[PDB]
């Protein structure tokens, strides 16, 4: 992401592609390495009634 | 007939219900007890069992089994063991207190019933099990028994009939469960009051491991009258298969809570208004009734308007006649708290023997306690319904059934009250 304009033009032309739009090096687009805590859902068998194991 | 009630006093069996006449032997004889008892004993068990069958008498201890057929289990040839009649005077069902009145005011009906009933069963003696709190009542019964011995009415050559019969009184020590027929037998034997599995049935292996019949105090005390006046006379009161007269207790929110004798199949409304003076605050102030003691499901006012007081009428209302103890709750009652307190009672009376009631009833109690405060979620209501169904029909004795039924009645007819209470707790938190 820090290539000079001349170098960006040179490598785009040599490859025949616009490489700057799809850089193979990652910067700030990736997700934060600290995330808010999850709250995961429970499955269909998490019920207090009409849930006898012999039916499932 | 199609209408019942308005029992005439000449048709009332327990003519000394209120203890306004001498309860001792002289008063009892003047009222018709002990009359022609020798002739009855000389007619033989088959004739005695025949009258009881024709009478349509059903067990007055709460389960309502046909008495004539039950007593006939004992009419078999002797195998060498003694045979016994155990009279269940445990009287422990909350709301119930009719057997207390017979024991202290008409004790000679019970003693004569023990002799007549014991003769039909071929028994040698009667053990009357009386709850230990009924100390004065047990003392009266004991004085009456002594009078009966001194007059030759019981004992060797009873009434001159040539039949030997003894009447023992043995007191309990504080346990509702000891009213259960096989727990009562276990208690007489000196053990903890834990019920037996069946089979064997008591008629084969009972008290001391002998042929035994357990009969309720009211059931036994009416047998001499049925024999004197005829099973046809008894069968002429009440609906078919619901024969006879019945002692009722009306307690709770009525003007004049009382014990009375009335015809079987009397309307519940008629019974409350004629004898108990009506519902506190009027009939429209009624919320629910528990018709047959704490073990029977409650019914709401809409059902009480027309329900008849007998076994089959109350089964169709999704409850039972039980002991015929009527606890009335008016509209000021916390119906959830009222039922919760009954579940607490069952938690304290469980003998603890078998898993579903030892664990389940205490579990139901904790859930009901939170339902009273509303500290629950509506999904727990169906959870509580399923829990009560895992106890009912899975336990050794009917106490587990008797705990599940009150809960099912509350959920059946008062779910919106339960849910509204949970909704209120949700806001205030
Ligand atoms: C070919 C020779 C070209 C000489 C030009 C050098 C130069 O300036 O390039 C860097 C400069 C930046 O390039 P970039 O890829 O964008 O860098 C990424 C960042 O922008 C860069 O930004 P930055 O933040 O990373 O900058 C920090 C960097 C600072 O970056 C620099 O200053 C690079 C300095 C390079 C100067 C070398 C001059 C050439 C001397 C000739 C001697 C060698 C040949 C014989 O700091 C350093 O690391 C410097 C440490 C010293 C590096 C050692 C270089 C010594 C080389 C000479 C050896 C002598 C012993 O290039 C340009 O700006 C484009 C014009 C330069 C001419 C390009 C011609 C390409 C060749 C034609 C195609 C033929 C292919 C076949
Ligand atoms: C927990 C429990 C308590 C009972 N208490 C009594 C009681 O106090 N008096 C009674 O007659 N029957 C009581 N019973 C019913 C007896 O087990 C039995 O059905 C009755 O004594 C039979 O006599 P009966 O046919 O004349 O009614 C109780 C049953 C249970 C399960
Ligand atoms: S149901 Fe309850 S009272 Fe009856 S035997 Fe089981 S634990 Fe004891």
Beta-sheet strands, E only, within B188-315: 212-216, 245-252, 258-263, 286-290, 299-300
B385 touches chain A (CB under 8 A): yes
Cα B205 to middle of ligand 1, angstroms:
109
Which experimental technique did the depositors report for determining this structure? cryo-EM
Dihedral (Cα; B419, B420, B425, B428), 10-degree rounding: 150
Chain B residues whose CB is inside 8 A of the A47 CB are 379
Buried/exposed B249-283: b ≥16 CB within 10 Å, e otherwise: bbbbbbeebebbbbbbbbbbbbbbeebbebbbeee
Chain A residues whose CB is inside 8 A of the B383 CB are 48-49
Strand order in the sheet with B166-171: B166-171, B125-130, B84-89, B212-216
Header resolution in angstroms: 2.3
The closest alpha carbon to B169, from B139, B202, B210, belongs to B139
Taking CB atoms and an 8 Å limit, are A48 and B383 in contact across chains?
A: yes
CATH number at residue B50: 3.40.50.11540
What DSSP string describes B109-148?
A: HHHHHHHHHHHHHT-SEEEEEE-TT-HHHHHHHHHHHHHH
The closest alpha carbon to B37, from B153, B168, B149, B156, belongs to B153
Chain B residue nearest residue A46, CA to CA = B379
SS3 B400: helix
Tokens 């002991």 correspond to: B323
Q: Is B352 in the pocket of ligand 3 (CB under 6 A)?
A: yes
Burial class (CB in 10 A: 0-12, 13-18, 19+), B331: middle
Residue B178 belongs to what domain range?
Answer: 25-236
């Amino acid at each position: 992401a820090s290539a000079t304009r001349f170098i960006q033009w040179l490598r785009n032309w040599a490859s025949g592609r616009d490489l700057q739009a799809k850089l193979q090096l990652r910067y700030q687009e990736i997700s934060k390495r600290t995330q808010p805590p999850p709250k995961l859902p429970v499955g269909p068998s998490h019920k207090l009634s009409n849930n006898y194991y012999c039916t499932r | 007939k199609t209408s019942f009630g308005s029992l005439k006093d000449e048709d009332r069996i327990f003519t000394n219900l209120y203890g306004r006449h001498d309860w001792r032997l002289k008063g009892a004889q003047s009222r018709g007890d002990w009359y022609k008892t020798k002739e009855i004993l000389l007619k033989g068990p088959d004739w005695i069992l025949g009258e009881v069958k024709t009478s349509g008498l059903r067990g007055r201890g709460g389960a309502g089994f046909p008495t004539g057929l039950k007593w006939s289990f004992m009419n078999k040839p002797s195998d060498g063991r003694p045979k016994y009649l155990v009279v269940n005077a445990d009287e422990g069902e909350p709301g119930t207190c009719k057997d207390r009145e017979i024991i202290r005011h008409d004790p000679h009906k019970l003693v004569e019933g023990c002799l007549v009933g014991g003769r039909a069963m071929g028994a040698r003696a009667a053990y009357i099990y009386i709850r230990g709190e009924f100390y004065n009542e047990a003392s009266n019964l004991q004085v009456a028994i002594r009078e009966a011995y001194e007059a030759g009415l019981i004992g060797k050559n009873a009434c001159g009939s040539g039949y030997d019969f003894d009447v023992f009184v043995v007191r309990g020590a504080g346990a509702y469960i000891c009213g259960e027929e096989t727990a009562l037998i276990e208690s007489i034997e000196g053990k903890q009051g834990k019920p037996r599995l069946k089979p064997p049935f008591p008629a084969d292996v009972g008290v001391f491991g002998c042929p035994t019949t357990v009969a309720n105090v009211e059931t036994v005390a009416v047998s001499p009258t049925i024999c004197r006046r005829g099973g046809a006379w008894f069968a002429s009161f009440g609906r078919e298969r619901n024969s006879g007269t019945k002692l009722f207790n009306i307690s709770g929110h009525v003007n004049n809570p009382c014990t009375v004798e009335e015809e079987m199949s009397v309307p519940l409304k008629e019974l409350i208004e004629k004898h108990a003076g009506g519902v506190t605050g009027g009939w429209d102030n009624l919320l629910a009734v528990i018709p047959g003691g704490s073990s029977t499901p409650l019914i709401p006012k809409s059902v009480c308007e027309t329900v008849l007081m007998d076994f089959d009428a109350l089964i169709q209302a999704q409850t039972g006649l039980g002991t015929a103890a009527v606890i009335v709750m008016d509209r000021s009652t916390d119906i959830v708290k009222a039922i919760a307190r009954l579940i607490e009672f069952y938690k304290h009376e469980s003998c603890g023997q078998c898993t579903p009631c030892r664990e389940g009833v205490d579990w139901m109690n904790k859930v009901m306690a939170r339902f009273v405060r509303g500290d629950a979620r509506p999904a727990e209501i169906d959870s509580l319904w399923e829990i009560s169904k895992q106890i009912e029909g899975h336990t050794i004795c009917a106490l587990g059934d008797g705990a599940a039924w009150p809960v099912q009645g509350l959920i059946r007819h008062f779910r919106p009250e339960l849910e509204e209470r949970m909704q209120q707790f949700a806001q205030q938190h």
